[PDB]
Write a protein that binds this ligand. Sequence first.
Ligand code: HEM
Ligand SMILES: [Ca+2]
Ligand SMILES: [Ca+2]
Length: 329
Amino acid sequence: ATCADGRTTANAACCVLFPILDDIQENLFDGAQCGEEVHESLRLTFHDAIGFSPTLGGGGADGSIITFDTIETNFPANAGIDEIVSAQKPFVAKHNISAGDFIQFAGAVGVSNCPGGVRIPFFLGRPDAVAASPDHLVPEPFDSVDTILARMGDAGFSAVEVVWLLASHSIAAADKVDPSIPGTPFDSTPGVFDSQFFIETQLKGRLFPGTPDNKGEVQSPLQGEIRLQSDHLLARDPQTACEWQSMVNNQPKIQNRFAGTMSKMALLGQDKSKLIDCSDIIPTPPALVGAAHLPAGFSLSDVEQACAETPFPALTADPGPVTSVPPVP
Ligand code: HEM
Ligand SMILES: [Ca+2]
Ligand SMILES: [Ca+2]
């Protein structure tokens, strides 16, 4: 099919997405960058979608976190997402797609801006939300590992799928976990979609990067990096440790599994056979930059081995003294 300006796509319904693509790239993502708006939009995809349970209810990836923002942004687990919900709302208002489609589309376009990123399949046609999500369906970083896995399982994800979706923490920071240091990232390369998250969470903790008594946070290996309690434990739990370790220096697997599992997340509450394939709209991401490494001054003896079947791979360290990671602007 050929769209209004001559750009093409397999399914013509998808032509609606070209001016939306252009508008969010310029006016949401600061000129197609992998920065804070892309990171918040990616988080939003999960907080919208995971509000789904075959028994507890919720419409899943239905745009409810925007349509019913006054309800959902008041759930404690949604702290900090009000900003991106406010930023996206006028795009939904202006443009010609459901809030469900818009959230997942913005997250996919966002990921494609990040060096190392992957094109996440995108389907169009989600109906409008019927009702606010129930509260208590979004995992919290202070939840037990088995609780997080059971919650994700109830929505349809295996434990290894949860590991793959957490590749998102490779381009991610926290503003509310420790509000003394907002914008502190979960890995040393929040602008690069890469394996450093899976490496750096496996290091022995050393220090709190800000204050010491924040719920859902544990010690970080690096100044200027924050570590969630949930990620710390998922990196070490028998259900997930070996899969977590398997991501290290495995860019193609991180890309392939993130894409396929985000597509599945993006379809929670929906039926792929009742939607239109618009995957060809998503831009080609930039090449990965950098290579898998231990942080400066670390060695393999600083890794806490938790995978019972295979040892953690040796990785070179960056040269020099240890360093601080700058916050996400
Ligand atoms: C599996 C359980 C998960 C837990 C416990 C968890 C927890 C968190 C927390 C506590 C934050 C910091 C929010 C803040 O204080 O600003 C965060 C940020 C983020 N999360 Fe996760 N998350 C989970 C899964 C996911 C998934 C499946 C995605 C997939 C899209 C995701 C994407 C993100 C992103 C991109 C950010 C960065 C937000 C920003 O930079 O401001 N998370 N997550
Ligand atoms: Ca929802
Ligand atoms: Ca990264």
